[PDB]
């Protein structure tokens, strides 16, 4: 009796070799359980053999079906399952259980075998950090032991493992499966077996390939958005973004309780939102230094610069102090008092709700902002005509600004108050640099 | 019992859910409560973080097992009560008597209106997946209903609720009863009432104006997902969710003469048929006014002779015309120069396949009337192009001398005289009396 | 027909709870299961993180609400099945069968043994809070019983289990049935048998011996907290959980002659009585050894005359002795100079004008020796307390003394001691028991 | 009557609870009053036998129902006034003034000092569960406090008080404000003063001595029970409540490189770090004086580079030594022949798990400093046994020629030269700027 169920999820309705795939596996064992899975019934018809061991799983709700019909485990009776991509074929007999023998004998949860197509499976490293909304891929140091595969491969694992994932068949499965299994610390072993390719392989023409790649990329972009992957890095570079940008809204809505939505989801600030924050801070600092306005890193930005030289990973804005008597030297700021100002490079310069301060937004739509806090000396004390509850929003000795010091921050060099360690612990408390904490720990703590 | 209060219908930007949950907890501190949501609501719902009040997030997540998004694993009780936002438990023991109403009656669901601005009404409902249609009406035998509309607390067994394919699809008021009515289950509307919230949600006309449109949006996304194209009510009102002149047609290009919907064991979507009928009416009027001799052909004439309308699985309309008449019509003469978009958006074209014409409903919607030009030979109507259809043949011209009226698709159309033998000559004997799919070798009736 | 599996008895260092929970999830993936612990078990239990499997922590915490430690809040079903570690579901439908039994039968608890090395046997059990005692025995009406010994899956209604005062106190095998037998509930021990775990915990003799060590510690703490100082068995076996030679006595100093335990509607703790009985025995033996003649006095004589033992709420033992004999015994001529700790731990003191022998330097349960001397045939002394029964009496009541069983040994009492007792206490005192101070609190 | 006087802090053997309860009943005979105790107080209190005075026994009992041990069962009013023994109501309406003040303001607790020898004073309090620490100090925003020191009547809503986990744990003056400060609640110290009992309790030195011994005993058990290992006053006058040289360490054998405190959503106990800093300091003092070449290694060097101290969730200290230098240290060269306890109770032993040495804080407390022998082979620093740790690597010996002073855990220790590049090699780029706990792959995250 068979112990593996072949499962086919990656194929296009408009052009596939799924009939050849299924028929190749049935030729080695006519009782072989085989499942083709789809979100809608594929048209043109697949016209698979109408036998009981060949079933087609429709994985979307229907008014006339029971809950079990859209659950893929309903269709698998065996202990193991083989994810076969379209374009693969079974020509050598018995490979399906050399893969189970290797899986049982080995130390990894998944075993894989390349399919001999134009894109044969390559072994990858993969780190998923939901806190940073990032997947980081690279070359696999312990190959053939991988975190993820790229390319065409049959993947075999226990049905109990595959169907306890939250998105077991989400598309592209080559992306979704290894994001789930890598995050669990599971490994996949690229076995030295090769599956033959379809005799007449699918998407032969350039135009067929072009439509398949366009829909695939669309599915991949929706997948990463749905799962909260905003940034995909390969070896730290070749950055692929899936978050906000200059034309969109920012990822998180209006903050309430000084606790943004991402903290309630046990994540930190989305990397697109940090990337836009760094870009805006440099732009503003560049403008102020060209205009001759004395600025200095303030609040959480100074604290992030003093600790690790960047925006704090869970912070949502950038804060700068400025000398009030310098506001006139900036075109953007002197216009910000009369009304909103969109400058030549799309940044919006505004005077605030109330609180006598200046916000500079990344764009008209994306409200990630640098806040500018103007102070004026008052007997050697820096003061403002307004305040907010926050502990670190206080007056302070002006001598902390008499010299200003370079301080690396967010990929450039900015000005900070002299002896910034002491000035930070005045506003925040002793030990702030060495003990990181969330904006509102009474609501949410690290 | 041991009913789990299950909250699904609410908006994250403006709701009454904390006061809802608090009200039930005041009657029973340990009352099991499950709030369901697709994504974690922000700003925070701020429910009591006590073990009997749980929040079930129905989204996929990379760090959660399959069970975390399946709501039946949050419900351990035998009965489950769907409570809408804006309701409230004042009179203690109200759930307890709903359960004993269920065990006594024969209905699988029992229901209690909520005294809000729109308490639940008792309705009838038939669902016809084959025709993509749900028909609501006034309840024949209230307080027994197929469905409800308005705010109600609905109690049923968890095994029954969670054996449905989409138990908590939104809006629940639409989704649940579509699934239960199709199964022949009844909902019993009881003589009990739940109170409204003291501060009901959506107090301002603007928030009262943001819910409906995401509601109407969610409702249209639901009916499309479940294959409901048309909703009708007693009173004649109709709500569409399919084609129109500004979209594409519902189904893609047809392979093997067998459209995709037939493989799904459905027939032609009601919006496609209805575009076809109003396109056939319009083209017939253009051709009559132009002095082009036309007659119903193929499946159109076959459906006319059966019941005076399009064959319910058919995907286009066919008319034959005299080839020597094409010049009489303005749209047909532009067609042989190129594609023509006329006064009311219909698209006239000379076809690439054969030597015939095609009239599309609109630029984006390629439901069409095909015009098959014929010319006489020695009393035999012929054309120079042919399809691999059995009914695509020549025929004696006397069948056209004269034409006879024949009701079709809501209007009177010209048909060949003696159309029974005409149809039998083209289709084979007994065609009128023996309906069959376009390609029985691939998919038969 | 919905049951929550509830796991409470396991050791964090060696358990089979993962196999237990998995086996029930083999029969139903949505089976509700609550694992209950006082602190977070480490090493980690590695349970599935699915909504129908929840780990409930019963101890208070600065960052959790009151509800978080109340276990009824984790259980929404009608029925509850306490399942001990080492058990596992193998047959299907086993908990519905138990549920059918419960509704069909008349017992509020139903139980099926686990096929471990200690399958549950039935047991009788009376609980006497007044006497701080629980008595076990063999069950006459088995399978209808008061308590169980060994491993079983117990099923009852959640409303029954969680209205008990300590529903999950450990060991639950001891704690649960003390509470249900006290209420008069019976447990029915069914035909059926749950299978044992395939890799059962406590494989090594070292591991078992650590589980039994801390299991004995929890049981002692349980009984002490719940007012059970003595566990006795048919056959005579005794388990003590009270005071001894090296502790405090169980109650503080007495005010208004009414000990604390009486205000709790309880009588003298049985360990305190035992201490008094062995001190009376030892002190009598010492006085007899030294030729000092003694006689039961006060409440000791009353209790001896009434039933041959200490009055069950009394807190000391009283002996009259002849003054002129006081020099005969070493311990007491020593007690006149200062406090004397003898070669067996007893503490002889002089105080009043009477002598006191304490059980030990830490345990101040005492025998009071009242020396009497004859003045013209009347037994009198020089200092008097404010008790009716503290009076002179004719010496002929001691000429001669008679043997009277008391506290496990044969004591010496005045002759015609019923008339003697009626002299000091008043008529009918033997057959009309009364608390030491009825003005404050009556019996 | 909307406030229930609750009396919890008193001693059975010496108290003025009778005077306390009678003072309030003279102001209003109906005044709801609850005296709460673990066991029946003896000598008997002899409180008035009326329905509005009730004694609550909070311990579980074999005979009583669950409700009897729940303090909310004994209170049916909206507010509760916690009144300490020694306090006394002399002017009418003081409880009703505290309510109008409680709802006018923004703090959830109000308090009035009692005119004893120890009237309540305003305190600051921060509660760090992850650091198992309770930091006290003078109250910057007085009279708005986080906590109180001394005797006050404290009034709050019963729903607030009785929803905390340990609402009446003793000493209340500590347990309550630990729970309320952690929730970000404030208490406002009002200008109202409750009088002292005419016969104050514990009026002798001996009565006070016994009361203080029990007080300190209950406070010590309360803090360990709630995981407060260290109490501070303005960063000083510390009080420890965790492990030490005479006990076992706080967590015990670490499986999967993940200690128990991580799963409890906390970091390393402060007593366990203090022992580690002490052992590291003592060990390098022995190594420098014995002529042993050492350098910070692993997470100790990383912590020293990041913030100059032990990483707050780390559980030992690691040092690289030169293998050939071991003979120079007497403690080390005794460790191979068997485990060795030295003059100061530190325990030097060869490794169970590999070929390295380990210095434990004491024979009972196994917080330890690991010492890793490396020998020079062909210019690279390498040992022969290895761990499946990522940072257990061979490294070039130039990193040790020379060595650098780096602050660490309160003293100055030796680190490799260019330790940033050193750390980056075995941990990865950005390691100093991007922290993470030891093995976050469990999926219990
Ligand atoms: O079961 C606890 C102890 O009980 C009796 O003393 C004996 O059974 C002992 O064997 C046992 O103590 C264990 O003894 C071993 C070797 O003698 C120690 O290694 C072990 O300590 C742990 O050892 C591991 C390495 O295997 C780690 O070094 C770990 O850091 C260490 N844990 C502690 C807290 O020292 C010891 N077990 C315990 C719990 O101390
Ligand atoms: C993956 O993560 C590990 C652990 O932080 C790190 O050492 C490694 O360099 C990472 N690899 C990639 C390709 O990001
Ligand atoms: C998850 O794994 C368990 C095995 O522990 C198995 O019983 C269960 O069926 C699995 N779930 C699915 C959906 O396959
Ligand atoms: C539903 O169908 C029944 C039977 O076909 C019919 O009698 C009834 O009129 C229909 N109701 C509606 C509202 O269409
Ligand atoms: C329980 O009580 C009855 C008295 O009514 C007694 O006969 C029986 O022996 C007691 N059981 C035990 C075990 O002593
Ligand atoms: C106690 O019993 C009552 C009566 O059945 C019930 O309502 C209540 O929930 C029980 N308490 C529990 C289950 O904690
Ligand atoms: C408590 O924490 C706050 C955080 O802003 C800090 O300002 C204050 O100094 C801290 N107080 C103590 C006593 O630690
Ligand atoms: C806790 O607060 C809730 C708020 O809904 C209240 O119903 C409940 O009674 C409170 N708990 C107690 C023990 O008072
Ligand atoms: Ba900030
Ligand atoms: Ba047709
Ligand atoms: Ba006596
Ligand atoms: Ba370390
Ligand atoms: Zn973003
Ligand atoms: Zn349509
Ligand atoms: Zn005792
Ligand atoms: Zn410690």
Swiss-Prot record, chain C:
Impact upon substituting residue 254 to M: In MDDGC5; uncertain significance
InterPro entries: FKRP_N, LicD/FKTN/FKRP_NTP_transf, LicD_transferase
GO biological process terms, semicolon-separated: adult walking behavior; basement membrane organization; bone mineralization; brain development; camera-type eye development; connective tissue development; connective tissue replacement; creatine metabolic process
Keywords, alphabetical: Cardiomyopathy, Cell membrane, Congenital muscular dystrophy, Cytoplasm, Disease variant, Disulfide bond, Dystroglycanopathy, Endoplasmic reticulum, Glycoprotein, Golgi apparatus, Limb-girdle muscular dystrophy, Lissencephaly, Magnesium, Membrane, Metal-binding, Secreted, Signal-anchor, Transferase, Transmembrane, Transmembrane helix, Zinc
Tissue occurrence: Expressed in the retina (at protein level). Expressed predominantly in skeletal muscle, placenta, and heart and relatively weakly in brain, lung, liver, kidney, and pancreas.
Effect of residue 42 to F: Affects the tetramer assembly. Decreases the ribitol-5-phosphate transferase activity of about 80%
Highest classification ranks of the organism: Eukaryota, Metazoa, Chordata, Craniata, Vertebrata
The protein, known as: Ribitol 5-phosphate transferase FKRP
Carbohydrate attachment residues: 126, 163
Substitution effect: residue 318 to A: Does not affect protein expression. Loss of ribitol-5-phosphate transferase activity
Entry binding sites for Mg(2+): 314, 316, 318
Function description: Catalyzes the transfer of a ribitol 5-phosphate from CDP-L-ribitol to the ribitol 5-phosphate previously attached by FKTN/fukutin to the phosphorylated O-mannosyl trisaccharide (N-acetylgalactosamine-beta-3-N-acetylglucosamine-beta-4-(phosphate-6-)mannose), a carbohydrate structure present in alpha-dystroglycan (DAG1). This constitutes the second step in the formation of the ribose 5-phosphate tandem repeat which links the phosphorylated O-mannosyl trisaccharide to the ligand binding moiety composed of repeats of 3-xylosyl-alpha-1,3-glucuronic acid-beta-1.
Pathway(s) per entry: Protein modification; protein glycosylation
Quaternary structure (record): Homodimer; disulfide-linked. Tetramer. Forms a complex composed of FKRP, FKTN/fukutin, and RXYLT1/TMEM5. Also exists as large multimeric protein complexes. May interact with the dystrophin-glycoprotein complex (DGC).
Region (Zinc finger loop) location: 243-272
Post-translational modification (record): N-glycosylated.
Catalytic activity line of the entry: 3-O-[Rib-ol-P-3-beta-D-GalNAc-(1->3)-beta-D-GlcNAc-(1->4)-(O-6-P-alpha-D-Man)]-Thr-[protein] + CDP-L-ribitol = 3-O-[Rib-ol-P-Rib-ol-P-3-beta-D-GalNAc-(1->3)-beta-D-GlcNAc-(1->4)-(O-6-P-alpha-D-Man)]-Thr-[protein] + CMP + H(+)
Subcellular location: Golgi apparatus membrane; Secreted; Cell membrane, Sarcolemma; Rough endoplasmic reticulum
PANTHER family: FUKUTIN RELATED PROTEIN, RIBITOL 5-PHOSPHATE TRANSFERASE FKRP
Annotated binding of Zn(2+), by residue: 243, 250, 271-272
